[PDB]
Amino acid sequence: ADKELKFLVVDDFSTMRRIVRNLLKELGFNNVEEAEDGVDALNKLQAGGYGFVISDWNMPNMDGLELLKTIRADGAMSALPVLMVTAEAKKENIIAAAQAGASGYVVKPFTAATLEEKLNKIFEKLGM
């Protein structure tokens, strides 16, 4: 819950990243970085230092699921909490996401309340 926790917000849509960034700020998290897609996210994650990933599901080059699978398979990123944030909510994804090891799942549009809830349960289930 260290409000210093570095978040990587991944979404191919600028406005959405802005919204998420601001919802995090409202919650007290100001250490937020943005990525445009899975590849751009990985390029940035290699630089280490990130403690939480909020990733959109649909993005070009490399979508959310693939990013999650890639993170979970990488020794160094393996334990990175990953919260899927998608507009949809198909049962298949939820299943795939969970199977791949998604730390949580949220349907946009969402409120700081909903986010806070999800972030809390994840910080809890883990240790932060």
């Binding site: 198909k90 049962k91 298949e92 299943i95 996401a97 949220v106 349960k121 289930k125």
Partner: peptide, 15 residues
């Protein structure tokens, strides 16, 4: 099965 779930249902099959 393209079926949109409620947030409540996502929390039920996720955890």
């Amino acid at each position: 099965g393209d079926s949109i779930l409620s947030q409540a249902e996502i929390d039920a099959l996720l955890n």
